Design a protein around this ligand. Structure first.
Ligand SMILES: OC[C@H]1O[C@@](CO)(OC[C@H]2O[C@@](CO)(OC[C@H]3O[C@@](CO)(OC[C@H]4O[C@@](CO[C@]5(CO)O[C@H](CO)[C@@H](O)[C@@H]5O)(OC[C@H]5O[C@@](CO)(OC[C@H]6O[C@](O)(CO)[C@@H](O)[C@@H]6O)[C@@H](O)[C@@H]5O)[C@@H](O)[C@@H]4O)[C@@H](O)[C@@H]3O)[C@@H](O)[C@@H]2O)[C@@H](O)[C@@H]1O
Ligand SMILES: OC[C@H]1O[C@@](CO)(OC[C@H]2O[C@@](CO)(OC[C@H]3O[C@@](CO)(OC[C@H]4O[C@](O)(CO)[C@@H](O)[C@@H]4O)[C@@H](O)[C@@H]3O)[C@@H](O)[C@@H]2O)[C@@H](O)[C@@H]1O
Ligand code: MG
Ligand code: MG
Lengths: 924, 551, 99, 50
């Protein structure tokens, strides 16, 4: 039963959601909803990014979740997802407008479990899983690194023995004169102090482990003709594949409802309290592991952490970084409550008053230990940073609803007044100069150095007056009209309030009397909708010209702190310097709501007595007056960025969902749920400065207007040179040589320059599809979910560090294994450019070489279960006893054009492991 | 309905309150802080990153890829208008300009009687704005002259870099310096605030740069203006400098030592401080990359062998005008100017006058494994045991960056007198002799080298007699080269003199043997003497910004 | 003319786990209750505060540690304790008269 | 299920104390008399100027 019945609403089967055994319920439905993309890195937490109906605005695109009627935007990884009874995604503006003023990016409606009338249920779910690291990037070992360095040296024509890295090469020339390597030897110690012995270290294996996931849920549900209740407890723990990274969560939910008199005075509440403790991986840990050469030992001769010495590249020890980061644990208390009262003066009138609260409290204590890894050190700096953050949101809602059933005319009239009110704050203390260097001793009182205090606060409010009218004739013609008047504190008084209408029409064709002979066609419905929604998800301080006293106490990398503190006297400090103010942004009093107009046309069908069901949707979204933060013109200086309504986005999309469930003669019940979706995104208008800086695409070379959001312009790589004749015949370019990348001459001017660039990257897949298969046979249930993406291109940064030598900022870094298969006179059958120590050709430029085909098809979740026969369970007094074994991310298929691995995560983000899970469910 | 109206900005000041009289002084301090906190490692206000194009130094780091854009600038090949460093330095300099403009706008709306120091503060702010404009003009020939503090932001889109010609832009830059000179006090109790002497010296420098006319579409010298040289001579008079108590230091090294900050020769410097309530202190983060490998990382700003050979002198104490670069300098058999050991740290010698650190030709002092040599710049570096050096993810010190030195004033006066050729060459010769005499006696920390490393010092002043204009100009060029090494002014001087192309080509040819990075280097006659206007800025301001000639 | 802000945060977290086994008997006029119990109590407290000075506007909206321009201080401490208990209780009633 | 709001302004000016409270208690009996699972929770928010 859809909550709108006349809009683009997707109902997710919650039973299949819990099968995947994911902490985040949103991550579970990664590819089960058409036109809704979920991207998850693979960290122990269930944090993921959601994009509904593509990219719809130049602002925050997270959809508005609704739990028990209370809206929010925080991720669901911090809430217990095992007590959800229904999930509905409202991807249509007309249908989702009535649920809030933040519905521009879509609304996901989540309903929690409630006690079923007249019965009691208890469910205990246990789950133990092992997560294994699968996407192991192949990097050069010691011998391979030496061979690659020798190849680069001989290709450049330099002496390979001058590497000054302890490698001594015995080599010569063949009959054709091409250099050949006979053998290599290494010095025992990398430094003259004999403190860093040479070793063959697998850094990826050193920093990875086999994670353990535990999940225990216990829920009890109570129903009656007269009231109901529900109490759930949950514990989740996930150890990541990366060492010293973990995430655990305790959860307790209590829901209840009471009916007084006979039917009047229905008072209900839903509350949940969660406590999540997490240690996250340091930024660029995978990059650090990939960059550091395998010759560096984990431990030095004296037992301290190993590190680069002499001429080895400056990279920290990833194991040491993980060890020092294991104490950066943060605790997060989440609190989602709601209490509502419903009054019924007579049969058709309802008055609902609702109060919802969301309180979040985050406490963290970060430590900075002194480290000395060879030549890598922080000058013995030890510090503590105690940070506290508070978020407090509350919403009050009043709803008046009237229903009439006059003849064949059904009429629902609803009005509503809503207030939303959010306040955020944070403050932190910073201390230095510690002695014991242990988390027990590192407290700000125990410090003996410079101290810093940081602190800020913000907030906003929203007011909404909405109305909804639904008319039904003969249960065949449906009309819906909703109107919203929304105001926010982020806008000035003149442009505070805005009006948004939406209309929906629906015709149940099967109800018409002219096709009663079509017995096979069980149900057919055609619906259309045209709606407008408002977007105001911008910075709270958007219309003010901000001047802030930035003294410079905040840590900055590179010294570009832009602080306001100058030693005007010239005494080299020694006290409190005079300070001032700096401009952060220029105010704009003409900012108003961004208007997103959505037109949707859908056809729902069901054939063969509800056996073959499905839906087909086509949508057109047009966002105008987009509140974008334009940067300064360049001579406007600091604080030149300002918010302006100068945007325009278009999204044209198709979605198709199908489902076929049927039994078999010998007792097999098969259910197939297929889904496919495609969309095209375009930017029609954009501010000149925004298009110039290329923050939304174009790389600052060409304007992204008229092209897909995020599209990138680069050169075109027409293979590599294989002879001097090819270099001479090709158009002249700097650094052209044998074995170097050849770049196409777009304008045919005879010279390769910055004007020889074109659109090369389009981050829009041709189509994304999913398929769920459920088989039941003799108490055996098998679930198999496949997700595929076709026609998507990806920019690969790992390729830049695997197909080239000395293509990074610093040289002598560790590279990929496939680098060994580079072009050479001895090995002409290769497309990888020849190794070189100098990037004369400038191959780090954006080009089609780094663009790879990201199409993939992976088995997201497979599960085989066994249900104990009812007689044995009744003997053991359990109403339902089930066991199951599942595999998540077990298998994947990728295109041959993708040189790397894991097309879903082709970069240095958190890896996605393979989960092998065993679980049991008891229904006492 | 007060539901949407209770809430106010937290911890910030709105734009309508920044004009209050009690905040203006704060804003003034802001205009100074941007000169010490607004520079990154890759974009410093000393402009050493863009001085690698000259013959004084290479680019440090692990290799060419470490700052590929800067390597392309150094070799003058493969330079694209869509480079991040050019746009970054443009944006940072204009950020300084607009901070100064905001302070000026706040100052201009205040009563003179209530605030007696209104004129002095306005003069200081004009001086800072003119300094930023001058550095932009040096980097880019065509710049936008933002000299209107009472300009609305919407009008900033209507500005253009072709509104004024080159001479008009130079005059607009010099107007602020003229106002500052007319309004700044003779002596400042606070060393951070510029004095009248600094304004006069910088105005003379601006007029000297204006003298070398760059009329026409191309960047070729089209003549020397006599009126500009007369103005230079007028504004560099020794009476003005002596009124502010400025003069050459007794020892050269005191210009680059923490113990002698804000000295007599320090006409105006950026005040860098430590232990001042900041997270790491207002240190010179722009020079953080320049620290040697012994200090830990990045080994940038390595002086070239050409400069070391230039420091070599003959038996008569004069620089080798034609045979200096034929052979590498030898410590045992070649007389050397003492200024070399205060500028370049050669292997086998103490580092920053510290006997405990000896520079060696190994990986402990070179990051590129000999690709960029083993020389270490010393002017911006400090002793490792200073206690003025702090590790803030980049080794930076509190040593002041001296923008204007009295030796610079003397050299500009000598150059103006030589170019005038109005029977006053002997005064320029006397100034050069004074500079050389100051250099000769600068052996208070390197005196023992003669009995420790066999170093022969031989510097003598030129004889006072009649000199030809070309010979005197050559001697002035040599004195400037040996006096302001590592100080990020060689390329600008070459561009101003109009001989940048020939000198850069000769340097490339000579150093291609000892440095492979110059294998394919090449300098264009009318394209590489000025940084191109960033492509992002031109795209942002369509039909208003014109690219420099040759692009 | 001293102006300052002091942002203080304190956390207290206590949890107790209890296990009770009780048996009751009603043999004739003899009533007997036997109870055993194992209890764990576990308390952790912490606090930290930041101190800033040199404010200009002098209003609660503007007084935040980021908006300060003077000397800053950081204070912080933590503590905790645990308790373990094994207890037993026996109740005997005769004729509902002797307890 | 209980909700409560209290506010007290002291006789001394600029001193006050307010408190919001929400309590939820429940108990469930399974089978016939075995497996009695219960809970009592209360959440309070007190804002005070002393
Ligand atoms: O802005 C648009 C466009 O510009 C890009 C294009 O590259 O960068 C420019 C942008 O980046 C900055 C950062 O402030 O400059 C980077 C730029 O500077 C160069 C020289 O030109 O390198 C400078 C040196 O910095 C080092 C120093 O590394 C360490 C780490 O702290 O410092 C200490 C010494 O005190 C040493 O012990 C350490 O090695 O590296 C910093 C540089 O390294 C980067 C770049 O890949 O990543 C390396 C990180 O990987 C880790 O493993 C994970 O943390 C770490 O070990 C390491 O930090 C990046 O994080 C840092 O910027 C040293 O290696 C260099 O010699 C260039 O190499 C570099 O390109 C800005 O100045 C400038 O605006 C992009 O940002 C963007 O597309
Ligand atoms: O991130 C910018 C923006 O986020 C806000 C608004 O909630 O708060 C986020 C703060 O969390 C910070 C570090 O403290 O990073 C986020 C990490 O903290 C976690 C903890 O669960 O997330 C917290 C917060 O972000 C979501 O996860 C986003 O959906 C929400 O579910 C949750 O409420 C964790 O998920 C992240 O790793 C940092 O970004 C912010 O301080 C604002 O404070 C801030 O403006
Ligand atoms: Mg071309
Ligand atoms: Mg100083």
């Amino acid at each position: 039963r859809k909550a709108d019945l006349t809009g683009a609403v997707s109902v997710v089967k919650v039973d299949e959601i819990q099968k995947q055994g994911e902490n985040n319920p949103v991550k579970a439905l990664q590819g089960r909803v058409p036109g809704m993309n979920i991207t998850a890195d693979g960290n122990p937490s269930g944090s993921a990014t959601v994009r509904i109906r593509g990219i719809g605005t130049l602002n925050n695109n997270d959809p508005l979740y609704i739990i028990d009627g209370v809206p929010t935007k925080a991720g669901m990884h911090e809430l217990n997802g095992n007590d959800i009874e229904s999930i509905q995604v409202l991807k249509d503006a007309a249908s989702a407008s009535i649920y809030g003023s933040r519905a521009a990016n879509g609304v996901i409606i989540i309903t929690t479990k409630q006690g079923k009338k007249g019965q009691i249920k208890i469910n205990f779910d246990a789950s133990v899983s092992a997560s294994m690291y699968q996407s192991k990037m192949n990097v050069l070992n010691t011998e391979q690194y030496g061979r690659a360095m020798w190849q680069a040296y001989v290709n450049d024509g330099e002496n390979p023995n001058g590497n000054a890295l302890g490698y001594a090469y015995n080599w010569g020339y063949n009959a054709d004169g091409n250099p050949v390597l006979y053998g290599m030897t290494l010095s025992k110690y990398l430094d003259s102090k004999n403190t860093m012995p040479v070793a063959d270290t697998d850094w990826f294996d050193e920093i990875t482990r086999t994670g353990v996931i535990q999940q225990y849920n216990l829920s009890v549900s109570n129903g009656s003709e007269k009231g109901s209740s529900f109490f759930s407890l949950g514990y989740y723990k996930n150890l990541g594949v990366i060492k010293d990274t973990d995430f655990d969560r305790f959860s307790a939910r209590m829901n209840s409802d009471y009916k007084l008199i006979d039917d009047i005075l229905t008072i209900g509440q839903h509350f949940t309290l969660n406590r999540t403790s997490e240690v996250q991986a340091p930024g660029g840990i995978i990059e650090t592991a990939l960059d550091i050469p395998s010759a560096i030992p984990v431990y030095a001769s004296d037992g301290s952490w190993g590190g680069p010495v002499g001429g080895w590249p400056d990279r920290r020890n990833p194991r040491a970084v993980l060890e020092y980061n294991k104490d950066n644990r943060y605790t997060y208390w989440r609190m989602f409550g709601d209490a509502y009262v419903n009054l019924t003066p007579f049969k058709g009138f309802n008055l609902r008053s609702t109060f919802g609260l969301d309180y979040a409290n985050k406490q963290a204590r970060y430590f900075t230990y002194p480290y000395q890894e060879g030549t890598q050190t922080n000058n013995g700096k030890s510090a503590v940073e105690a940070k506290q953050e508070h978020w407090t949101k509350w919403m009050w809602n009043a709803i008046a609803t009237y229903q009439l059933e006059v003849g064949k005319h059904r009429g629902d009239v609803m009005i509503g007044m809503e207030l939303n009110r959010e306040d955020d704050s944070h403050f932190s203390g910073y201390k230095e100069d510690f002695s014991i260097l242990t988390p027990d001793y590192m407290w700000p009182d125990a410090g003996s150095g410079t101290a810093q205090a940081y602190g800020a606060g913000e907030g906003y409010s929203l007011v909404s007056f909405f109305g909804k009218m639904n008319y039904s004739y003969a249960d065949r013609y449906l009309l819906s009209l909703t109107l919203r008047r929304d105001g926010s504190s982020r806008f000035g008084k003149n442009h505070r309030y805005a009006t948004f209408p939406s209309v929906s029409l629906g015709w149940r064709i099967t109800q018409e009397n002219f096709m009663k002979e079509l017995t096979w066609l069980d149900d057919l419905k055609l619906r259309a909708s045209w709606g407008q929604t408002g977007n105001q998800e911008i910075s709270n301080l958007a219309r003010y010209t901000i001047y802030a006293p930035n003294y410079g106490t905040t840590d900055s990398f590179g010294g570009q702190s832009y602080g306001t503190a100058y030693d005007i006297t010239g005494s080299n400090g020694g006290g409190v310097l005079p300070s001032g103010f700096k401009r952060n942004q220029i105010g704009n009093d003409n900012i108003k709501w961004e208007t997103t107009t959505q037109t949707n046309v859908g056809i729902d069908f069901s054939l063969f007595k509800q056996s073959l069901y499905g839906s087909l949707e086509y949508y057109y979204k047009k966002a105008t007056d987009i509140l974008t933060e334009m940067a300064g013109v360049g001579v406007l200086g600091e604080g030149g960025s300002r918010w302006i309504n100068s945007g325009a986005m278009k999204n044209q999309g198709f979605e198709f969902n199908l489902g076929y469930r049927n039994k078999t003669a010998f007792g097999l019940t098969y259910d197939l749920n297929g889904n496919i979706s495609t969309y095209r995104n375009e930017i029609l208008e954009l501010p000149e400065t925004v298009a110039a800086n290329g923050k939304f695409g174009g790389n600052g070379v060409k304007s992204v207007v008229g092209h897909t959001y995020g599209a990138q312009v680069g050169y075109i790589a027409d293979g590599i040179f294989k002879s001097q004749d090819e270099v001479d015949n090709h158009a002249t370019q700097e650094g052209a040589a044998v074995g170097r990348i050849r770049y196409r001459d777009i304008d045919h001017n005879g010279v390769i320059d910055e004007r020889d660039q074109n659109w090369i990257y389009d981050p829009t897949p041709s189509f994304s599809y999913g398929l769920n298969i459920y088989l039941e046979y003799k108490n055996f249930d098998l679930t198999m979910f496949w997700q595929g993406v076709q026609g998507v291109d990806i920019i690969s940064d790992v390729k830049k560090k695997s197909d080239f030598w000395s293509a990074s900022n610093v040289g002598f870094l560790n590279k990929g294994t496939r680098l060994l298969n580079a072009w050479s006179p001895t090995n002409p059958n290769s497309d990888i450019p020849a190794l070189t120590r100098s990037d004369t050709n400038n191959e780090q430029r954006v080009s089609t070489y780094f663009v790879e085909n990201g199409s993939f098809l992976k088995l997201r979740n497979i599960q085989l279960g066994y249900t104990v026969p009812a007689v044995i369970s009744k003997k053991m007094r359990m109403d339902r006893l089930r066991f199951y074994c599942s595999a998540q991310n077990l298998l994947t298929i990728k295109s041959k054009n993708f040189t790397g691995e894991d097309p879903e995560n082709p970069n240095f983000s958190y890896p996605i492991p393979v989960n092998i899970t065993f679980g049991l469910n008891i229904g006492f | 309905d007060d539901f949407l109206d209770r809430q106010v900005p937290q911890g910030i000041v709105t734009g309508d309150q920044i004009a209050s009289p009690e905040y203006v002084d704060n804003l003034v301090i802001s205009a100074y802080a941007i000169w010490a906190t607004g520079d990154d490692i890759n974009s410093s206000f000393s402009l050493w990153n863009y001085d690698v194009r000259s013959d004084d130094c290479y680019k440090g780091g692990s290799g060419t890829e470490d700052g590929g854009v800067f390597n392309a600038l150094e070799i003058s090949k493969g330079i694209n208008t869509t480079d991040w460093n050019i746009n970054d330095i443009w944006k940072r300099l204009y950020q300084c300009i607009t901070r100064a403009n905001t302070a000026l706008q706040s100052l201009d709306q205040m009563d003179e009687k209530t605030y007696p120091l209104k004129n002095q503060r306005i003069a200081e702010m004009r001086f800072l704005r003119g300094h930023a404009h001058f550095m932009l003009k040096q980097l880019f020939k065509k710049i936008v002259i933002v000299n209107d503090e009472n300009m609305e932001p919407d009008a900033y889109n209507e500005l253009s870099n072709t509104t004024y010609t080159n001479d008009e832009q130079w005059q607009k830059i010099a107007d602020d310096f003229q106002f500052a000179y007319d309004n700044l006090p003779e002596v400042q109790i606070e060393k951070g605030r510029p004095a009248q002497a600094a304004a006069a010296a910088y105005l003379a420098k601006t007029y000297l740069y204006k003298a070398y006319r760059q009329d026409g579409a191309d960047n070729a010298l089209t003549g020397i203006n006599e009126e500009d040289l007369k103005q230079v001579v007028k504004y560099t008079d020794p009476l003005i400098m002596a009124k502010g108590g400025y003069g050459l230091e007794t020892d050269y090294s005191m210009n680059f030592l923490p113990q002698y900050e804000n000295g007599a020769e320090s006409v105006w410097a950026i005040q860098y401080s430590i232990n001042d309530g900041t997270y790491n202190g207002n240190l010179n983060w722009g020079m953080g990359l320049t620290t040697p490998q012994i200090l830990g990382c990045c080994d940038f700003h390595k002086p070239s062998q050409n400069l070391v050979n230039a420091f070599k002198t003959d038996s008569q104490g004069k620089p080798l005008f034609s045979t200096y670069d034929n052979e590498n300098y030898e410590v045992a058999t070649d007389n050397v100017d003492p200024r070399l050991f205060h500028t370049v740290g050669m292997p086998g010698f103490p580092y920053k006058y510290n006997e405990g650190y000896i520079i060696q030709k190994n990986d402990d002092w070179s990051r590129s494994k000999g690709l960029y040599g083993y020389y270490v710049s010393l002017k911006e570096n400090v002793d490792p045991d200073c206690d003025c050096l702090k590790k803030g993810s980049y080794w930076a010190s509190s040593l002041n960056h001296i923008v204007i030195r009295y030796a610079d004033v003397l050299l500009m006066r000598a150059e103006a007198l030589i170019q005038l050729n109005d029977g006053r060459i002997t005064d320029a010769i006397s100034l050069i002799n004074e500079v050389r005499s100051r250099a000769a006696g600068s052996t208070m920390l390197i005196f023992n080298y003669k009995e420790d490393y066999g170093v022969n010092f031989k510097v003598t002043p030129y004889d006072l007699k009649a000199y030809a204009q070309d010979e005197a100009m050559k001697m002035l060029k040599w004195e400037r080269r040996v006096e302001f090494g590592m100080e990020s002014s060689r390329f600008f001087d070459l561009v101003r003199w109009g001989e940048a192309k020939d000198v850069i080509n000769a340097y490339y040819v000579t150093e291609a043997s000892r440095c492979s990075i110059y294998k394919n280097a090449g300098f264009t006659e009318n394209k590489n003497e000025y940084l191109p206007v960033p492509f992002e800025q031109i795209s942002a301001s369509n039909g208003n910004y014109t690219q420099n000639f040759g692009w």
